[PDB]
Design a protein around this ligand. Sequence first.
Ligand SMILES: CCCCCCCCCCCCCCCCCCCCCCCCCC(=O)N[C@@H](CO[C@H]1O[C@H](CO)[C@H](O)[C@H](O)[C@H]1O)[C@H](O)[C@H](O)CCCC(=O)NCCCCCCc1ccccc1
Ligand SMILES: *[C@@H]1O[C@H](CO[C@@H]2O[C@@H](C)[C@@H](O)[C@@H](O)[C@@H]2O)[C@@H](O[C@@H]2O[C@H](CO)[C@@H](O)[C@H](O)[C@H]2NC(C)=O)[C@H](O)[C@H]1NC(C)=O
Ligand SMILES: *[C@@H]1O[C@H](CO)[C@@H](O)[C@H](O)[C@H]1NC(C)=O
Ligand SMILES: *[C@@H]1O[C@H](CO)[C@@H](O)[C@H](O)[C@H]1NC(C)=O
Ligand code: NA
Ligand code: NA
Ligand code: NA
Ligand code: NA
Lengths: 202, 97, 269, 239
Amino acid sequence: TQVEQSPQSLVVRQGENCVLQCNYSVTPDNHLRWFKQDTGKGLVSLTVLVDQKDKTSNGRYSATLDKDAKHSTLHITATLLDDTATYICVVGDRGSALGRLHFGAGTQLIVIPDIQNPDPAVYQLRDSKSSDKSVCLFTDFDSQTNVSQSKDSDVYITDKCVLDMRSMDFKSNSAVAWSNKDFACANAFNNSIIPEDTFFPS
Amino acid sequence: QKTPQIQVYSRHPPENGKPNILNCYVTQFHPPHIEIQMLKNGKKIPKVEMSDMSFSKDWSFYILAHTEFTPTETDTYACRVKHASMAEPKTVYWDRD
Amino acid sequence: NYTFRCLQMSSFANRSWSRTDSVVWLGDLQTHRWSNDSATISFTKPWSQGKLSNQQWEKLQHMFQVYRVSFTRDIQELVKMMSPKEDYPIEIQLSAGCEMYPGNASESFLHVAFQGKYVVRFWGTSWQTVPGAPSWLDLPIKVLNADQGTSATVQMLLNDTCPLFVRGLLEAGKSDLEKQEKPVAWLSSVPGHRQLVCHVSGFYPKPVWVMWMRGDQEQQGTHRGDFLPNADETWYLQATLDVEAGEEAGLACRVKHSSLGGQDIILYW
Amino acid sequence: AAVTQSPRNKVAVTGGKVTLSCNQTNNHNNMYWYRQDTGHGLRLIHYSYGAGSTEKGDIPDGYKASRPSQENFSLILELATPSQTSVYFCASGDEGYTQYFGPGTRLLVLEDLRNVTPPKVSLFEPSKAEISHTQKATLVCLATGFYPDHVELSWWVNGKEVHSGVCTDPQPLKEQPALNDSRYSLSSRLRVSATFWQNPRNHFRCQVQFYGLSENDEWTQDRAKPVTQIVSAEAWGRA
Ligand SMILES: CCCCCCCCCCCCCCCCCCCCCCCCCC(=O)N[C@@H](CO[C@H]1O[C@H](CO)[C@H](O)[C@H](O)[C@H]1O)[C@H](O)[C@H](O)CCCC(=O)NCCCCCCc1ccccc1
Ligand SMILES: *[C@@H]1O[C@H](CO[C@@H]2O[C@@H](C)[C@@H](O)[C@@H](O)[C@@H]2O)[C@@H](O[C@@H]2O[C@H](CO)[C@@H](O)[C@H](O)[C@H]2NC(C)=O)[C@H](O)[C@H]1NC(C)=O
Ligand SMILES: *[C@@H]1O[C@H](CO)[C@@H](O)[C@H](O)[C@H]1NC(C)=O
Ligand SMILES: *[C@@H]1O[C@H](CO)[C@@H](O)[C@H](O)[C@H]1NC(C)=O
Ligand code: NA
Ligand code: NA
Ligand code: NA
Ligand code: NA
């Protein structure tokens, strides 16, 4: 292909800086655009570079272009959880509608959130309609905890997931487990290495 | 569309038995696609040189063909031009005079 | 006083087939050739690089190489855009360069013909249609004028590159530009009407004077033909006179040319 | 400059006719259709320079394009194939180089539709223990038994969509991972302050938009036709 991005994917921790690269063989090279694409969503333009030696910025994003080297870098300063996305490089071969766009295959960035005050616990939640049906919620563990699939294949366990209570400036991880097959919340997360201080109520 | 004008003329004064150069100058045609043959006795001469095609102030094209030849008492020399503006190839014979 | 002309011809037969060929002239002397078959511009004179360094020439050639490929796709796309207002086959001609004046003065030009008609020029900072151009060309113009990168490059080519380059060429090519080559004449006749022909060949530069003469008397019936080129960058001309048969006697052809140093050619019939 | 696309999501069968539409009110002459597949950049299928103009892009095969007006540019898949499963993007522009992209359309072409099934949706109310331990209340929504995995889960409080304090599984899990036609499950959480959950004027709803059959898709089975539909589950706050 004519447009290559590097790395393919990377994982960083919240607050860290990272650099993404784009190299191309497109001729001629009128301009280069960086897009951010969140999962499922569409294309949000971050910046466009137009000059032989160019530098742009947009908040915590800054970018460079060197047309002689056919090389661009996107720099993200002090990453936040919402930077988790695919970043796409695009070269336009004309300064008009006569141009074709040449898209890179993208760089997948994952930003691990900083959990300040962890409080690991497993809670039992009851169905709003059918009160004898329930799920088990493992929540408030820091980013070091890994959640594993169950031993039993009639027990379901989701991967971890981070929510952000924006107004309270609060983040938390959680995973959910359920089964009908005998099944209780103290047993639910045994296949996982869970913190020793994990609260089990009742 | 415009019809090619053809002018056949020699580089040096013509003398029987003396090597010379024959020129065929094709002008005033459009479009530029054209086929030019120089002929000895109605037969196509092998090593015919062509100048690059160019065009005038008025945008009409022109090109120069030339070849080595030695004029004689008997031999005829011609320039044959095929162009879309003409139904038949136009042939112009070297006058000598 | 010299005109430098870059002449480009392109034929687009259908959506897939095309070729672009260029020739470059300084006055009536060819300096460059760029065939569709060639990746690089060819010098047709030893001095065709002018006063440009190797790095400057390589850079300028590279820009033209990008240009040729880009031009080709652009026309194909503009045809799609205007469809079905215009269809193949299509001829595009460009005539671009600069006329060089005394002092440090010059005027640059870039003229574009479409199917043999002058329709578009670059002027100042943008492309424009000229009088007589069809209105459908306003869309191509708007599209071309959207490209600021091309406009910046063209402005520099025309304002700066062309006159600087041609100044270098005039210095480097001086001895070819100022060459003097002698005309050689000979006489003949054709059909009681007789058309005499004075043939004049091998002269350079172009300015020449040819007349039929009876002694000191200039025959004011002489029809000067066209200037026709020779292959060796010299010129050919013939002058014809219509006379009665038997009236041939005493008639001469006089030729005046700068290579002769006053010593005219006189050939009596 | 705004571009819209419809449908936003589509499940189709092999051999079916699929039409993807793109609308644009910018008075842009030029419109463009692309597909995005993992491992590749967006690739150009067809484009158009105005009403009546359709042009082949880089990968036109299996697609027809239609530009009936300045506003509308359609991508027609006359005989849908599984290889046309992708995310499709439309864009528009004027004489300038900028292309303005629509939000994308996800298409899934299945070999057969026999297993298409909508979700059951259940909402799980916050633990009393969580409330006392944290002063926060986590609601859980579970969508189960659905096929295929083309669902959009959203949370609504008093008829308005909420995003803060939400997280939904990045992908559905397979209920029978040993099967090729396994049904899916998906979970989501909404976390609010205890006092927000305790307020009995707050009405919570987890909604799953499921993409299934159209009204015109043939259905030969006894069970209810698994049409595109919303399934939801609901609860009020309480002291
Ligand atoms: C000129 C005087 C000579 C100087 C003296 C030097 C002497 C050396 C010897 C010369 C030997 C060479 C002889 C060749 C003769 C040619 C002379 C004319 C050359 C003049 C044109 C040069 C343009 C350079 C820029 C350019 O290339 N622009 C391209 C590429 O653009 C992209 O890339 C650049 C960076 O590389 C920038 O990033 C741009 O932003 C980005 O878009 C564009 O696609 C451009 O559009 C190409 C076509 C330009 C052109 O034809 N326009 C003429 C108007 C045509 C009208 C069409 C009408 C039409 C026809 C059919 C249907 C509808 C309409
Ligand atoms: C380049 O020169 C032009 C003016 O020169 C004329 O156009 C050239 C392209 C060429 O054909 C010359 O021989 C001509 O004499 C400048 O154009 C002017 O630009 C200003 C704004 O920048 C504008 O207000 C004027 O109206 C323009 N003149 C005309 C006649 O339209 C141009 O700026 C020069 N560019 C550079 C980069 O030097
Ligand atoms: C296009 O033109 C060329 C040259 O005239 C011709 O040989 C060729 O067959 C044409 N191509 C098509 C697809 O018609
Ligand atoms: C002219 O040159 C281009 C680029 O090298 C090429 O693709 C094309 O086939 C050539 N045309 C002809 C008629 O040879
Ligand atoms: Na555009
Ligand atoms: Na294009
Ligand atoms: Na183009
Ligand atoms: Na793709």
